Symmetry: D2
Subunit: 381 residues, 4 copies
Amino acid sequence: ATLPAGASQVPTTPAGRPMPYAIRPMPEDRRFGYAIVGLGKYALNQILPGFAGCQHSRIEALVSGNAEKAKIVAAEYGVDPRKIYDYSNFDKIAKDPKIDAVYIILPNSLHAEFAIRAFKAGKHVMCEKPMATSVADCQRMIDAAKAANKKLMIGYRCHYDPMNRAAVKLIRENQLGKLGMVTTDNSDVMDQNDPAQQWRLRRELAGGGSLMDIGIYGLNGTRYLLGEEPIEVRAYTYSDPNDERFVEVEDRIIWQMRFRSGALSHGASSYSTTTTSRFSVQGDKAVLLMDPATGYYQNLISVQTPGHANQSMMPQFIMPANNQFSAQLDHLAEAVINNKPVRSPGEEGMQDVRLIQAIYEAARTGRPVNTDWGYVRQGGY
Amino acid sequence: ATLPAGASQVPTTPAGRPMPYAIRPMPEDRRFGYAIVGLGKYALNQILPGFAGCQHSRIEALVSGNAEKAKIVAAEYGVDPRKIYDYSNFDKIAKDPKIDAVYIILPNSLHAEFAIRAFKAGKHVMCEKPMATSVADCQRMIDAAKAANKKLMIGYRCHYDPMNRAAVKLIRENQLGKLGMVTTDNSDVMDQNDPAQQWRLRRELAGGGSLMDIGIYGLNGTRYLLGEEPIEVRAYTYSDPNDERFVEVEDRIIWQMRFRSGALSHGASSYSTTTTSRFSVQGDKAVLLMDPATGYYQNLISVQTPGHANQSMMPQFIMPANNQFSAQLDHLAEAVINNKPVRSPGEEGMQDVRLIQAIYEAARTGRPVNTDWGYVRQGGY
Amino acid sequence: ATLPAGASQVPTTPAGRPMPYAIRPMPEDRRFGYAIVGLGKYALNQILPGFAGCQHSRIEALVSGNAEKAKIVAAEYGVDPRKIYDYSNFDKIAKDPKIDAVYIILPNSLHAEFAIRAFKAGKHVMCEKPMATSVADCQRMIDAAKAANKKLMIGYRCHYDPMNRAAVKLIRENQLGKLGMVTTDNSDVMDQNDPAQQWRLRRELAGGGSLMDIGIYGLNGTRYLLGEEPIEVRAYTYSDPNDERFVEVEDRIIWQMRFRSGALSHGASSYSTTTTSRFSVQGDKAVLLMDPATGYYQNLISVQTPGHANQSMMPQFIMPANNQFSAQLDHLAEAVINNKPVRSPGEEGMQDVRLIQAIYEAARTGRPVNTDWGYVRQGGY
Amino acid sequence: ATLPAGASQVPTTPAGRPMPYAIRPMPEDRRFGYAIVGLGKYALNQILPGFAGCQHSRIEALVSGNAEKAKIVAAEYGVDPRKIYDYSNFDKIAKDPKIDAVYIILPNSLHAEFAIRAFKAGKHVMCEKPMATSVADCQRMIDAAKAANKKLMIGYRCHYDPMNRAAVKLIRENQLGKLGMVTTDNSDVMDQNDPAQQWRLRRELAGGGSLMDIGIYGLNGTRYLLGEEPIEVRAYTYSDPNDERFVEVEDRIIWQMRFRSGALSHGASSYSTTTTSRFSVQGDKAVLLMDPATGYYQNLISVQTPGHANQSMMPQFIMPANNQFSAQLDHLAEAVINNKPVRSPGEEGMQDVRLIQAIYEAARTGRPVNTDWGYVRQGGY
Ligand SMILES: NC(=O)C1=CN([C@@H]2O[C@H](COP(=O)(O)OP(=O)(O)OC[C@H]3O[C@@H](n4cnc5c(N)ncnc54)[C@H](OP(=O)(O)O)[C@@H]3O)[C@@H](O)[C@H]2O)C=CC1
Ligand SMILES: NC(=O)C1=CN([C@@H]2O[C@H](COP(=O)(O)OP(=O)(O)OC[C@H]3O[C@@H](n4cnc5c(N)ncnc54)[C@H](OP(=O)(O)O)[C@@H]3O)[C@@H](O)[C@H]2O)C=CC1
Ligand SMILES: NC(=O)C1=CN([C@@H]2O[C@H](COP(=O)(O)OP(=O)(O)OC[C@H]3O[C@@H](n4cnc5c(N)ncnc54)[C@H](OP(=O)(O)O)[C@@H]3O)[C@@H](O)[C@H]2O)C=CC1
Ligand SMILES: NC(=O)C1=CN([C@@H]2O[C@H](COP(=O)(O)OP(=O)(O)OC[C@H]3O[C@@H](n4cnc5c(N)ncnc54)[C@H](OP(=O)(O)O)[C@@H]3O)[C@@H](O)[C@H]2O)C=CC1
């Protein structure tokens, strides 16, 4: 019959009010400083814009071999033009104490190099995936991290994507029952004219074909969805011999893996078919379909049983968790601040490279490769 | 300003009217008489009920080893108690001209026998899939068919399924661009307490495990979707050794194939996980998702591109085409009446048995098996 | 390590087996004989074919004003040519004990007549909706029913529809929280060239336009979803004056209702737009979307909350419940046999006719019409 | 056989490269300066964070009556603490030539006030919806805009949301055929304890209930989807008399409108049921379903016909157009820069308020209100 206290007490006159309700991740500070190395497609389309959403990170400086671009980029994000390094004086960042970490967004073959030069610079490292083009180079990056007593983090965004985490969460709850068969697919049409794609066609720079580039999402995903490691691996690859895009690196490759629990999986990556990011986890109770499974946006998951399809996706008005990009950046910032192990350490990034090598080996020999090497996911998936 | 002639002409008193518009297949004739062999799960749940929707077929007789069950089923479908046969006096159907064909729905290893006896009895044959448990037996059936000058059709219900034909049509019309990667998955939890599943647990009666039973859908489907034959296959199978269900047949099995066009495929079948029937066909212009892919009901397909998902399924009020069960049944009928070849001939059933053989061989030896033997799909896919 | 007793016991030679597991409603008996009246669109497309799936019903006779059509239909459904009646000798069915009930599928204005003659002939009645074209006529039918001591059931197929019952069940179980707003829409393009639509264009034969024909679904559905009766209605209708289809009946009409609980609803029906059958039920905890809501096939419902869409539809392999056509038919049958009241009695059909009357009145006067007349749903919704 | 020129020419050594391909809206500058007035829920959750994505806008200063908050906010977005005004010295912004415009994000009753004081300050105006609490106050805002020769823009984000524009685009293409029936629903549970909701419960501050707050999306949407104005209106409202939340403003209200083309529509807004944002446009060719229809994120649209559902939504990896928030902000910036009329001028915002008044009037009197007042959408919908 009567308005509650608060309503009637609101002044019909201009008056300040308390802080509003938060339905979205609010900014909190920018204490952690980042130095972005490699201003390419991913860096300028996804990572740089992804800072605005961070709660504890900022872009302190840039590192590029194209002075002009690095200039324009500096302006857009207001980075001090004096904090613009190149690949030869990159080490001079050790002087600046405001540059807490470095984000390596360079070709796969250059990752390690700048990670080590970074650690010797006493800075923390955030390296893109795949880690490096060799298991040995991954180990070195890890060795250089422990020496400088710094943290090494691999850019596994899917480890910071709400829907992916929701997927892991529901699976741990045993919503699918006993796990028995995982299926994954990751694809996109390779455009040789794309500046970012040219280095990907060189085995020396990329380290391999579609598997190293996107099939790793299937590999990595199969691992955290099932929450365990493969003990065995089998694989096959094929590329049109008349396609100049696959002279050095593979187009399509298919791998089958077995897990300790007894679960199986089959997946593939492709450079010659359109966008595909689909993961399927089959249990004896229900089946999970993630599609889109690893998109930058619009992921969608569904738990199906005869007669039902329970879909989950980002809300339309509220935002229960920060986006993967911002969440990934702040994660390292957090890790350091609160002195804690990062969820995606150098070891994790090395596991995938080591597994990928085993897979390329299996496809070359047509024989299965034993991958039961006691790796342990510290901190869980 | 005035009603059309059709409206104003309708009398306002009880009056005869013309034949109505058909928004669904109408019954036409019951010229083709069938003798059903084996009153089991598929027969009583799907085929017998499937007869009602037929436009040229009827159930004329029954053949069962359970007189009690046969008596009950005959009464339910208006079958004359005098036309109930057992497996001993089966051959006597040769004396009844009202029996035009037989439909074998017996376990796998019993197929060839009855197909042959049926042909010796001067009848056409509809045999359930998988055709037989040996390539040789498939050929013997094809031989008996040719010696009797009768038709041999294999129960590939998906070859008469409205949504599957629609998927084949948009592919042939190049809606997906060039085809490069196909993924299939077919699973369902095997229940050893189900009378129907008991013979499936026996290698001698079944001819194999999940591949023979349901993996065949991913295989056959991959073939009719791509519109070409595999020239090579690789595979690996695994089953929990402590599970009483898989002592003789396999639970999970995965296979990879390469086609003359260069396309690749990877699929699996499972006897230990929940209901999955999902086909994916990746083209360089679009991706096709069939899910459910091979259901008895509610099939749904979708053509995806960045930003779009065009779905197709059976309408909610109209029924443009007959269901797969009824259509399959009328297909043999029409073939005989029109003196035309069947779309699912014994040769088609044999190609699958032959391929499954290659797949089992490959999983056994851990090596790729060449399947470039020149099978040619007579009449398109 | 060893197969279960059930598996090892299966003989390897042709042998009789037990009755299989049912993943779908099996035929049981054909005790209840029906006489179908009016071999038109609904009858030949939906009802006659709907008999096959029945578990207690059968077609015993036909009543048509087109001897030619009746002869053809009788042959298609095994009906004895001797049991074909016309509208003149209809009353003679009273002499046949094999005729237990009649199913009136004649245009609206002819319903009451035949329902009454059927009752005078000592038969039960299944009458299509909308019940009649006047409240009085509905009561006369109810009176004839009570005088004959027979049952009167109205063809509300959605009251026996698996997905609609599921929607009613999750609502009753408070899955949507408190109910506050319901939206309905029912449309389809009226084609004056369709023999079936010709009488629908005539006010005298139809009793009204899209509201009487299909608007009734949104109305009836709003009532069974909310589980309560409207106490007040408002409405407005409009039809293009130059369209020959709407000279006598309305094309588009919209209505609003308020219920005792306080809930509100707003829906419409259209004779000029494409296929729409969508029901929305807004609760304070969740929102339910039925779309298609009242299809002959492929119904789908979804319970939405920020970040989720839990879908439910008929399974792809199993059939937990019989279809609405067959179930409706068996419902009257079982009621007679079990000496139990029907769920869709003449009173239910009358409540709708009465409400539609109020709605037309409201649109005519532009004022709200009070409908708080105390109808009570006997047997729940 | 050989890698194309570009691939082989990429240096295996650290080397700068040209600007990458743009798959996402890139930043371009921040020439247009904004002064945000009213730091509430919407301002801090949606508008402030929405600047990072802009290509021509920045946050030059803030205006608040809560010094402390306005401080913290300044820090987070790096706004010069000297450019922090209050509601009494707000006019002092006229001094600063770097403050090109003002974004009024205050209670509905305060909109006009600050718009006029803004225009006299020689600045451009971006006012939130609904425009004001009276047609007269809207006219004054327009008069004050022409005097200062500045631009007036209403915050109709949906006029800058990709999916909404895609929806308008497909409809103009006649993909739905002749338009005949639009249905809309907009709801969310009102929380009286929410600081932002308290003023919304006061008729003096809000100007009305759910209609003024969110039902306006249905009203506005119905207009640009059909691309025309209503000539007539009818409406009804009801709220639980024992609910202290609706003593002064309405909870649920339902309106029906007719359009010149002959199209009809029914819609409603609610403060007592969960999130609902669903628009339906029915044509005689197809039907469009927008659901979510006006979300901040995850909108989804579908074009349905018997057997088809063509869905469209934001891509998962690319981003063809900037988000509604950023797009809205830059729109004004554009309008000014290129000297052009804004798509959402004060007149448009006044049309909705004028229509809403007509609707409240219709519900009060229970009679239809003629709204055929020759309004014209300059620039189209
Ligand atoms: N997490 C994920 O979602 C994704 C991660 N990535 C990873 O990010 C890294 C970069 O990928 P992407 O941005 O697509 O690639 P681009 O080719 O767009 O960027 C590579 C950048 O590296 C720098 N660079 C230095 N020397 C070399 C060299 N020898 N050849 C080529 N570039 C060089 C350049 O910076 P400059 O011109 O400024 O000097 C160049 O712009 C890869 O490791 C990739 O796997 C990429 C996409 C997605
Ligand atoms: N196209 C498709 O969708 C499907 C095809 N099928 C195929 O249908 C066939 C039968 O499968 P299903 O109906 O599930 O099996 P069931 O075991 O339920 O039925 C087989 C019937 O065969 C007869 N029979 C004769 N000798 C034997 C024997 N020694 N062991 C078991 N049965 C025997 C029995 O009939 P009676 O008691 O009358 O004598 C039995 O009921 C298989 O080849 C299977 O692959 C099955 C399901 C789906
Ligand atoms: N539950 C639901 O889903 C549906 C219910 N219905 C209802 O079924 C009833 C019939 O509809 P529908 O089948 O579409 O209509 P049709 O006009 O196609 O069939 C009506 C039948 O009534 C007989 N008839 C007798 N006198 C007349 C007369 N003067 N004018 C027209 N028909 C007459 C004819 O049968 P004959 O030629 O054999 O003598 C005619 O075929 C209606 O009450 C309708 O509301 C319809 C569709 C769906
Ligand atoms: N386009 C859209 O999507 C949306 C638009 N809006 C519109 O934005 C406007 C504000 O909505 P919203 O942010 O939800 O509301 P909040 O109550 O969260 O914000 C109102 C802000 O107005 C200022 N204010 C000044 N005096 C008053 C007063 N008398 N009472 C209340 N606040 C006052 C305060 O700023 P301070 O405390 O800093 O002094 C307050 O924080 C409304 O017109 C609303 O319709 C809102 C949501 C969605």
